[PDB]
Design an enzyme around this catalytic site. Sequence first.
Site, PDB file in Angstrom:
ATOM      1  N   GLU A 171       0.702  -1.477  -0.363  1.00 53.49           N
ATOM      2  CA  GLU A 171      -0.033  -0.202   0.150  1.00 53.49           C
ATOM      3  C   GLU A 171       0.854   0.940   0.206  1.00 53.49           C
ATOM      4  O   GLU A 171       1.107   1.658  -1.010  1.00 53.49           O
ATOM      5  CB  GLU A 171      -1.034  -0.211   0.810  1.00 53.49           C
ATOM      6  CG  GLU A 171      -1.499   1.000   1.814  1.00 53.49           C
ATOM      7  CD  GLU A 171      -1.950   1.498   3.046  1.00 53.49           C
ATOM      8  OE1 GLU A 171      -3.343   0.540   2.982  1.00 53.49           O
ATOM      9  OE2 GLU A 171      -1.414   2.015   3.978  1.00 53.49           O
TER      10      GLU A 171
ATOM     11  N   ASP B 149      -5.236  -2.589  -3.004  1.00 51.11           N
ATOM     12  CA  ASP B 149      -5.303  -1.976  -3.481  1.00 51.11           C
ATOM     13  C   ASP B 149      -3.972  -1.110  -3.442  1.00 51.11           C
ATOM     14  O   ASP B 149      -3.033  -0.630  -4.716  1.00 51.11           O
ATOM     15  CB  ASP B 149      -5.577  -1.104  -2.499  1.00 51.11           C
ATOM     16  CG  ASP B 149      -5.053  -1.386  -1.197  1.00 51.11           C
ATOM     17  OD1 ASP B 149      -4.340  -2.976  -0.840  1.00 51.11           O
ATOM     18  OD2 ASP B 149      -5.159  -1.089   0.135  1.00 51.11           O
TER      19      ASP B 149
END
Length: 388
Positions: A74, A135
């Site tokens: 991330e 993500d």
Amino acid sequence: AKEMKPFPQQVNYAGVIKPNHVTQESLNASVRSYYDNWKKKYLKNDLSSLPGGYYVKGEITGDADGFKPLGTSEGQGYGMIITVLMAGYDSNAQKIYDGLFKTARTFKSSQNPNLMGWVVADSKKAQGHFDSATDGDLDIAYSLLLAHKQWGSNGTVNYLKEAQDMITKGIKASNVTNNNQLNLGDWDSKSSLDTRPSDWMMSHLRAFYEFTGDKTWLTVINNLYDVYTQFSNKYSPNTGLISDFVVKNPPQPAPKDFLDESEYTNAYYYNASRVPLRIVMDYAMYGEKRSKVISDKVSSWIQNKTNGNPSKIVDGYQLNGSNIGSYPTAVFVSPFIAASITSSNNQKWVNSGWDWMKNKRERYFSDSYNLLTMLFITGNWWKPVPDD
């Protein structure tokens, strides 16, 4: 200097406002200073296990499979986007970017090797040991499209080809589900209906389509808007919020303690705090009206909730708008400001939000998302387009 899109690009997206009580030069100056501090504090290149590798110093408590975690995919993705956008101010950006990319590919996922494992730890044993998180890979793949448009793909790293491989052989293969959602990572099932709405990076998926021609990305975008509205009409009809995790069909809030992440996985908590930025960028960059509708609803709710005072935002809300948190932090505040940029009636609120966020320094998570938000709402996050 070989940047084709040097900072500051200061673009003016149709239908969106920037803070207007200071000049564009003042906006760019605030971003330069914020980056100076962000880079000094969080950008690291001290992996004895990977000479030349760069990563972003995160906050992982405590050990991960016996390793001391130093950063995550991330943060890797945040830092890679930031690095390409600040190129032309940062005169070492391409070297840093290629070092971030080196880490992302060395710490590849144990499941799909076209993705990054979610943990960076200073051990060769950790390289290839961990599974992915959706993500992180979305931001990393998107950053390679920015890099392709920033420096071109004819040097040491073929950014466009790397992006196309990560998008198609990585994210599409492992994370695009049979129901046209995004699952939680490449450890998750191709048929899973578990999803994290802060992964619904609509404007990234638009770029994936423009650089691959794979209509899968458009069908996922269209489905995710449908899911957002189906969820919110039932569970957040007045706030427009969405939960940290969403499960089932019809979509509903995840249970508390979902994947053991927090007691508030059913609510608008630290994962979902990022959603309003991910959604509103689709209106700004691609003109998607469904994004304006979602953004305006959330923006109007929080403005009324706080009486127009961004310092009254707290770190977490129930879907009906009741407070969970207790203090203002940028990963909540700044996306609420970004959500507000699609109506000129929000100018004073956007100006107030800018004043709150522009020098707000705290920790890795809020600072990194703050910087991404600042880059976007000042016009300095430009759109990668397959032009020439």
